[PDB]
Design a protein around this ligand. Structure first.
Ligand SMILES: NC(=O)c1ccc[n+]([C@@H]2O[C@H](COP(=O)([O-])OP(=O)(O)OC[C@H]3O[C@@H](n4cnc5c(N)ncnc54)[C@H](OP(=O)(O)O)[C@@H]3O)[C@@H](O)[C@H]2O)c1
Ligand SMILES: NC(=O)c1ccc[n+]([C@@H]2O[C@H](COP(=O)([O-])OP(=O)(O)OC[C@H]3O[C@@H](n4cnc5c(N)ncnc54)[C@H](OP(=O)(O)O)[C@@H]3O)[C@@H](O)[C@H]2O)c1
Ligand SMILES: NC(=O)c1ccc[n+]([C@@H]2O[C@H](COP(=O)([O-])OP(=O)(O)OC[C@H]3O[C@@H](n4cnc5c(N)ncnc54)[C@H](OP(=O)(O)O)[C@@H]3O)[C@@H](O)[C@H]2O)c1
Ligand SMILES: NC(=O)c1ccc[n+]([C@@H]2O[C@H](COP(=O)([O-])OP(=O)(O)OC[C@H]3O[C@@H](n4cnc5c(N)ncnc54)[C@H](OP(=O)(O)O)[C@@H]3O)[C@@H](O)[C@H]2O)c1
Lengths: 245, 246, 246, 245
């Protein structure tokens, strides 16, 4: 089965809810051992994986310190990293604060780079292959509004996905990204609660629905598998048609 | 509950006698789809591979020199996966490029791709059935290349149709996506691999440091044809060793 | 030493009787180029505008229903700027889209654009002369739209040719670039502006909050035809009010 | 003349050398008053503009403090901003330091956002129109190698160009970017000195030459002018054909 992840061991950040939860569940169903990284205990995610017969555990980590994972990989045996943890801050750009800039950059971009660096340093030292899946955004391609640090960060994530593939593809680490469309999770709750903005989003989705977190799992399994061994530096949009429209 | 399984599905793969089409047909059959191998000549080698793997496949002889050749191929036929892989390329200095080398490439790579997809979707839409289309694009859907103006124009056109048709049919349950292969080993690329200077220049621009294999394209075609990709619509997935990143 | 001046240059603008082609012809002439206004019918309104501004222009009658119609238009004619603006669009559900609506759009928008550019460049390359090509692309070189499959495929194809021809001819001093207009006020877009719901939906997706003017496209065509853009090759410049950013 | 900048007043950052110098010279030749912002006196740039008969002056500012321009716009009358100041740090990504991350992000991305914010806050308060031209990069589109903070930053600059156009286009501030190709300046000196890397770059440029700083000036005049009033959120590559190839 070229889509099996048996024998792999994944770290999924932001794994307690939303996309990270669905990805952790999907990787475990595909056969990976999954460590569910989160800043609070991923009780529900672990319950779901346990009920499904999968193999998972927790890691508590807080990327407000963007170097928080510096020692997480040494002798730990990870060979899939899903960089899903992320935050957003919404304000008019003319009054956007330094705090809302820095805190978003720290989690979404800086912590993504240094966590990936520590993961790859271990693989490269051990002479092993592995996979990185970054969670990008439609705001890696378009600008959106009122989220300057988020759009800048998510564009940056696409940039790092390309550069790190350029440097590491020949060393056996595939680095790719998924760009989800508009998915119903805590990240988008404020948009969904705004009737006008919600309608404007919905009518720009050719599939005619908001995504569900489970819609992102299949691409994460794929990009972590041998069926994607020649995929490097790609940004795959899983968006109901948004970028086509 | 295997989201990559194609059990119960029925695929038509064009250009299925060789190269990427052969590998895609073999991969779809191994994932559980019944596969009809569309080709100009009997795709016996492809059918033999599938039969040895225990899969279910048959041939359809079709020649896209008539770009409307598939107009009646889908009525009551049960297809719900279409892979538009047949394609050709013609090389000459653009200042001298002939009308024939323009027209013949457009006919197979772009016009036939549209009209074959139209007939496939007509049948699904008429019956309320879901389905999947996977178009084979190229790096030359994104970059220009040289000396192949009808091929670059056609492969850019394929990316455009992938987006428009997704835009029009996503809500009707027809996923339309594309794979853009990079440099993959097939019989048609042996001449590039045999030219030492050209091969070196190609490899220097591939981060992975190797040509792809046809099975790498087959894996992506199974993914985009499966429930694992149900919310993927209008996407162009590059399977390229890093080429476009570099 | 005005890098935007086109004094001494000679341009052919297709579709020059109306809309964007008319504005581009007027803008190039105001920048100092001699302009030949190519059109199916006498471009008298365009010529009158240019004559009142004190510019130098004349007509060429040409019909791209024959996509090779310009094959002999450039020999010894002195053109060193070409703007490929002529284009049409046909709308129908993609599942019903006709071969005629496919072919006629491809012929004008893509095949004629290639062969007209080929003839223009043949003359420059044969003589060692520098020159400029500006292709008129579309938002539908980037996104899909709906119900216009031959137009989206053709305009994606135009972006591809812009890249390939730049790739092949940049070192010979022929700059090949494109402008992708967004939603611009011309006679051909009056029906969209007249449909209140369609117009509202368009405006909601334009950050600038307005339709563009044909003169906005003319300004970009003068820039890309000038020494101010000498290192710009293979670019597709969107002039779109913010559409693609949004 | 739709390309004239008479009556406009521009701030050009990084104006002492390289692309910023050429842009400042080009804007002044088009008729703008140009303030040449730099961390050291832009003696040569001012001499060139003076010889050409243009109107220019200096502003000393150091974006190692990314908020350094917070008070630069109040009652100053700027209505063109060219965000050109930028740095690069080259190292293998597996050993890339936090310092080389943060310092590049500070100048190339964070300072770009907050300088633009202060410029726009003044325009919007005064009810005036204006123009922003950001200097992006080929590494806003591709990954490159060994420059993770630079690629992430320059992707981020493209993202901000789109988002700020989305928010401000209707308020009369055009925000666009130029993505130069490989141009001979101090930024690329280390590449040009490496014979192998230099050759690999050159042979990927269809025009057959490295750019010169003067090749970037015309696009900056254009994007600052009335001839570009409907151009918003665009990233114009001025690259000798690189992205086509
Ligand atoms: N439409 C969408 O939903 C959408 C679209 C595109 C991309 N994304 C991206 O998808 C990813 C997942 O977001 P989501 O939609 O699932 O929304 P979410 O519920 O906000 O998920 C964010 C996850 O990141 C974790 N996280 C945030 N800050 C952290 C920190 N300092 N340390 C450790 N973990 C931290 C969150 O933990 P807590 O639960 O404790 O807050 C949560 O697990 C994010 O990168 C987001 O940008 C979402
Ligand atoms: N391999 C690569 O690196 C690469 C890169 C990017 C994209 N592509 C694209 O991927 C697709 C497959 O490439 P490949 O390398 O496998 O090429 P290939 O070996 O040349 O095979 C092309 C296939 O198309 C069929 N075909 C051509 N003209 C036809 C016609 N008039 N009617 C019916 N079938 C026709 C061929 O049939 P016959 O055998 O009878 O001629 C053959 O099966 C093509 O669209 C190609 O452009 C390939
Ligand atoms: N306006 C927009 O918002 C918009 C947006 C994106 C791209 N575009 C593109 O910009 C270009 C100009 O658009 P427009 O709005 O000005 O359109 P238009 O008013 O429809 O004008 C099209 C021009 O093309 C000429 N043309 C059509 N078929 C021809 C043929 N067989 N032979 C010779 N000339 C022919 C037309 O001549 P006749 O007058 O004799 O028919 C006319 O001059 C087109 O390529 C269009 O697709 C426009
Ligand atoms: N191929 C290329 O040359 C290329 C390609 C794409 C984009 N770019 C971008 O073009 C822009 C200009 O670079 P360049 O090629 O002209 O090279 P450069 O000589 O390195 O120019 C950078 C300019 O930014 C200034 N700067 C750097 N740090 C600063 C700080 N902390 N405070 C104030 N000013 C600071 C520099 O001042 P000093 O002179 O005092 O160091 C110099 O004026 C940069 O954003 C660069 O990323 C260059």
């Amino acid at each position: 089965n070229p889509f099996s992840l048996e024998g792999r061991k994944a770290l999924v950040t932001g794994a307690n809810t939303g996309l990270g939860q669905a990805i952790a569940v999907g990787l475990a169903a595909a056969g990976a051992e999954v460590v569910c990284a989160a800043r609070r205990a991923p009780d529900e995610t672990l319950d779901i994986i346990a009920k499904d017969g999968g193999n998972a555990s927790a890691l508590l980590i807080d990327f407000a310190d963007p170097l928080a994972a510096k020692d997480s990989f040494t002798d730990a045996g990870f060979d899939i990293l899903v960089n899903n943890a992320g935050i957003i801050r919404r304000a008019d750009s003319v009054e956007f604060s330094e705090l809302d800039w820095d805190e978003v950059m720290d989690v979404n971009l800086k912590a993504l780079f240094f966590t990936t660096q520590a993961f790859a340093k271990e693989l490269l030292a051990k002479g092993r292959s592995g996979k990185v899946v970054n969670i990008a955004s439609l705001l890696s391609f378009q600008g959106g509004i009122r989220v300057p640090s988020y759009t800048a960060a998510k564009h940056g994530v696409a940039g790092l996905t390309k550069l790190l593939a350029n440097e590491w593809a020949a060393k056996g680490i595939n680095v790719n990204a998924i760009a989800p469309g508009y998915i119903e999770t805590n990240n988008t709750e404020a948009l969904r609660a705004d009737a006008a903005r919600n309608k404007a989003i919905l009518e720009r989705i050719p599939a005619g629905r908001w995504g569900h977190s489970e819609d992102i799992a299949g691409a994460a399994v794929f990009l972590s598998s041998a069926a994607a061994d020649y995929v490097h530096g790609a940004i795959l949009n899983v968006d109901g048609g948004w970028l086509a429209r």
